[PDB]
From Swiss-Prot, chain A:
<feature type="glycosylation site" description="N-linked (GlcNAc...) asparagine">
    <location>
        <position position="64"/>
    </location>
</feature>
<feature type="disulfide bond">
    <location>
        <begin position="37"/>
        <end position="45"/>
    </location>
</feature>
<feature type="domain" description="Ig-like V-type 1; required for binding to polymeric IgA and IgM">
    <location>
        <begin position="1"/>
        <end position="101"/>
    </location>
</feature>
<protein>
    <recommendedName>
        <fullName>Secretory component</fullName>
    </recommendedName>
</protein>
<feature type="glycosylation site" description="N-linked (GlcNAc...) asparagine">
    <location>
        <position position="116"/>
    </location>
</feature>
<comment type="function">
    <text>Through its N-linked glycans ensures anchoring of secretory IgA (sIgA) molecules to mucus lining the epithelial surface to neutralize extracellular pathogens. On its own (free form) may act as a non-specific microbial scavenger to prevent pathogen interaction with epithelial cells.</text>
</comment>
<feature type="glycosylation site" description="N-linked (GlcNAc...) asparagine">
    <location>
        <position position="71"/>
    </location>
</feature>
<feature type="disulfide bond">
    <location>
        <begin position="21"/>
        <end position="91"/>
    </location>
</feature>
<comment type="subunit">
    <text>Either free or part of the secretory IgA (sIgA) complex that consists of two, four or five IgA monomers, and two additional non-Ig polypeptides, namely the JCHAIN and the secretory component (the proteolytic product of PIGR). Free secretory component interacts with bacterial antigens toxA of C.difficile and eaeA of E.coli.</text>
</comment>
Curated annotation (Swiss-Prot), chains B, C:
<feature type="domain" description="Ig-like 3">
    <location>
        <begin position="8"/>
        <end position="98"/>
    </location>
</feature>
<comment type="subunit">
    <text>The basic structural unit of both sIgM and mIgM molecules consists of two identical heavy chains and two identical light chains; disulfide-linked. N-terminal variable regions of the heavy and light chains form the antigen binding sites, whereas the C-terminal constant regions of the heavy chains interact with immune receptors to mediate effector functions.</text>
</comment>
<feature type="glycosylation site" description="N-linked (GlcNAc...) asparagine">
    <location>
        <position position="51"/>
    </location>
</feature>
<feature type="disulfide bond">
    <location>
        <begin position="130"/>
        <end position="192"/>
    </location>
</feature>
<feature type="disulfide bond">
    <location>
        <begin position="23"/>
        <end position="82"/>
    </location>
</feature>
<protein>
    <recommendedName>
        <fullName>Immunoglobulin heavy constant mu</fullName>
    </recommendedName>
</protein>
<feature type="glycosylation site" description="N-linked (GlcNAc...) asparagine">
    <location>
        <position position="58"/>
    </location>
</feature>
<feature type="region of interest" description="CH3">
    <location>
        <begin position="1"/>
        <end position="102"/>
    </location>
</feature>
<feature type="domain" description="Ig-like 4">
    <location>
        <begin position="108"/>
        <end position="209"/>
    </location>
</feature>
Length: 118, 227, 227, 225
């Protein structure tokens, strides 16, 4: 509940994206884990990038995560999106099992066009 | 004639605030009139060095070069030079050491694995693996502690840093301890401590006994009164 | 003018099955008139060793000749020598090499340890530690196997043998496999193979999965009341 | 006067590491001045045999050539010949042996099955089956090692490779072991080692224990008022 971020963010494939999530500027939240996880119909966040350094094997080079304790913020940058990335996600801190977190939705769509007449 | 330049650990500093820096030469020839001089990067020499080594029993002859500096100086990161001037090769060899710059700070994540039940069936000895992980820069220090009495290091052995396969920068290390199973069967928890310069108060630690580590048995007996 | 002959090792020979012996030189010049001759005890044939070294950036020369042979014979104890005939010196230069019988033997016993609950708590990446123990001689080897096909030696890291403190120079070592817990939550038995000459079949495995430290029984006692 | 030659069998070479093939000449009459040798693809000189058995019960003559080799030589796809120049045979009998190269490469998948309770109800002796299957060529060699010590072949039995019924040409095999219950509930690691040429390390093994299962169980006690 004390975490705050954007509800839904849309972009199309090949582009970059940058997401910001907020936490109260206390001591621990300036000095503890931040994460970006992805859930599904299987019961559990699978961690994709962490503030401690670990990046998921499927996200190497794709994305990273940075924390600005002075802004009371941490930022998530994703590039090279695809349609396989659209789903439900969560920003959050501390142990993934609890919910000191915030839920994010993500929808990726292909870059349309191909019509020189429009 | 081989020289080890020995920079003090961050741990040695922080537990002494006494940043002695030394350089040892190993298996040279102990003549007398062995001379080594500590100088800064400027060439200017520094305080002297006393209590210097003597001839070893097994011809692996040695000479300790003691020195001192101000801690901020090492934090400033300028090259330090002890140079060997002995008649064996009166050519002055150059031992230049510094502090790297640009290393970020990262914390140890000390887990502590308990001995495998299999080893408990060879029925004599038990082993516990204090672990540190994902930390920068190098040179963590660790020791083991139990029942409020320290454990003289000949019980435990520790690794040194070496990079993670996955983390581009973060090193890790180990420690191993061997104890009679009955001693671990006695209960008799154990605490491994780590000191490292990305840790808030510089020192964290964890513990384990028979009950904490991988118990087959969960015995909660919780009472909830006056709903 | 110093020449070394490289001895095959259980790590090497097991990685090749094809024990091969070669030779290296220090401080020689890089021309023809190179006589690489591998010898039996009394000096039988050398194989057609090809792919020799090239001129070294300091113009030293090292002449290399490999002789892939049968395997038991080196174990059988046949002294082998490396004789050379260079332009810089005419005098023959021969380097004896053989299997060094002597020091006694001690089997290992690999204990595999499953990742700490804490680490799985972070559910970040699971590290499994394979901990070889108290064996002799050195030159252990390990590689990680699951579903029968192996994993790249980059996915894990073992420092070479350390002496053991408590026992005399019986050694130990350890490698750590680190994996996505998001996979170690799935099964994937992930066994760790060990090679050591003292081993009655030369090769042992143990393994573990999640269901290896799982507690057997809960013992809940809920006494909800309003008294 | 009949020439046989037993090729070095992978099971035998494993227990020995001393690869050995022997040419047995059967129903030869008991002459002497008999020249029996072992030769490589170039007829190269071997070391001789030793310890001929006594003359046959049917009063015939058994010629056996025991030669020790390097293991690669037989697996290097290189033929061997054992020659006999008997009295009755005016010529040397050079017969060529070659490993059946071209056979498929199928490693086993050992599933060491644990013993159910029914037998662990007369409290007499557990029975452990080291099922092996899904593999070819034949000559898998299986034996049980205990906590660092071998088990001599009394304690266990195994079948011979029986081809799989429904799966195409291949093989399986059985093996069995017996131990009393107060062992299989006492410790008793009980690993079962499989030696077969298609394993990466050429040797795998598995083990089980009294507690190789027996999943999570609850003593939930729920007193309320």
């Amino acid at each position: 509940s004390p975490i705050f971020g954007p509800e839904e963010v849309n972009s199309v494939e090949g582009n970059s994206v940058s997401i910001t999530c907020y936490y109260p500027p206390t001591s621990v939240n300036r000095h503890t884990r931040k994460y970006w996880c992805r859930q599904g119909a299987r019961g559990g966040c699978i961690t994709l990038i962490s503030s401690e350094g670990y990046v998921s094997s499927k996200y190497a080079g794709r994305a990273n995560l940075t924390n600005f304790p002075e802004n009371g913020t941490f930022v998530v940058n994703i590039a090279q999106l695809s349609q396989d990335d659209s789903g439900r996600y969560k920003c959050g801190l501390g142990i993934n099992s609890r919910g000191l977190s915030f839920d994010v939705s993500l929808e990726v769509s292909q870059g349309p066009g191909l019509l020189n007449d429009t | 004639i081989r020289v080890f330049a020995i920079p003090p650990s961050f741990a040695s500093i922080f537990l002494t605030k006494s940043t002695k820096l030394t350089c040892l030469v190993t298996d040279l020839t102990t003549y007398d009139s062995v001379t080594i001089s500590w100088t800064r990067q400027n060439g200017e020499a520094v305080k002297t060095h006393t209590n210097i080594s003597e001839s070893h029993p097994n011809a692996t002859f040695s000479a300790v070069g003691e020195a001192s500096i101000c801690e901020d100086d090492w934090n400033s990161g300028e090259r330090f030079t002890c140079t060997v001037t002995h008649t064996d090769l009166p050519s002055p060899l150059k031992q230049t050491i510094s502090r790297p710059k640009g290393v970020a700070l990262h914390r140890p994540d000390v887990y502590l694995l308990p001995p495998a039940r299999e080893q408990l069936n060879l029925r004599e000895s038990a082993t516990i693996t204090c672990l540190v992980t994902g930390f920068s820069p190098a040179d963590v220090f660790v020791q083991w502690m139990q029942r409020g009495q320290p454990l003289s290091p000949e019980k435990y052995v520790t690794s040194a840093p070496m990079p993670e396969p996955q983390a581009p920068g973060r090193y890790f290390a180990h420690s191993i301890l061997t104890v009679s199973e009955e001693e671990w069967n006695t209960g008799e928890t154990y605490t491994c401590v780590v000191a490292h310069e990305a840790l808030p108060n510089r020192v964290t630690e964890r513990t384990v006994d028979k009950s904490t580590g991988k118990p087959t048995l969960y015995n909660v007996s919780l009472v909830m009164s006056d709903t």
